[PDB]
Amino acid sequence: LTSLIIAEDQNMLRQAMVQLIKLHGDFEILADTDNGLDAMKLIEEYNPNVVILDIEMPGMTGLEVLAEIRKKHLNIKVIIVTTFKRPGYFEKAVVNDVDAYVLKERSIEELVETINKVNN
Numbered sequence: 718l719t720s721l722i723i724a725e726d727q728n729m730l731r732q733a734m735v736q737l738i739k740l741h742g743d744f745e746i747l748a749d750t751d752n753g754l755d756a757m758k759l760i761e762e763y764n765p766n767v768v769i770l771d772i773e774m775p776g777m778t779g780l781e782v783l784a785e786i787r788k789k790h791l792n793i794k795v796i797i798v799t800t801f802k803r804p805g806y807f808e809k810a811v812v813n814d815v816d817a818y819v820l821k822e823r824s825i826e827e828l829v830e831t832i833n834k835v836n837n
């Protein structure tokens with residue numbers, strides 16, 4: 718299947734994504750965490766095909782994690798998934814070559830469609 722790491726600040730939503738993403742699509746979750754520094758280490762350890770990153774997290778924000786994955790040219794699709802409607806955050810994701818930016822206005826079903834489009 719497609720491997721994923723999920724880094725998300727909120728435990729309730731994070732555990733929900735780990736469970737529902739596996740049921741809504743053809744994915745294996747290698748690791749999940751609420752800390753961006755933790756995520757960056759897991760990412761280098763496991764090399765997942767795709768990562769899902771919240772923005773505002775302790776350690777490293779999702780945007781700093783995205784920036785580092787790109788600096789290092791890792792073969793990894795990156796989806797940011799956030800509540801933030803602020804214009805600044807979307808522009809920072811785009812300039813850093815994010816593969817998709819998904820608002821939490823979308824369902825996990827839509828997020829899965831997005832991962833599939835991105836990974837094809």
Ligand code: NA
Binds near residue numbers: 739742
């Ligand atoms: Na599945």
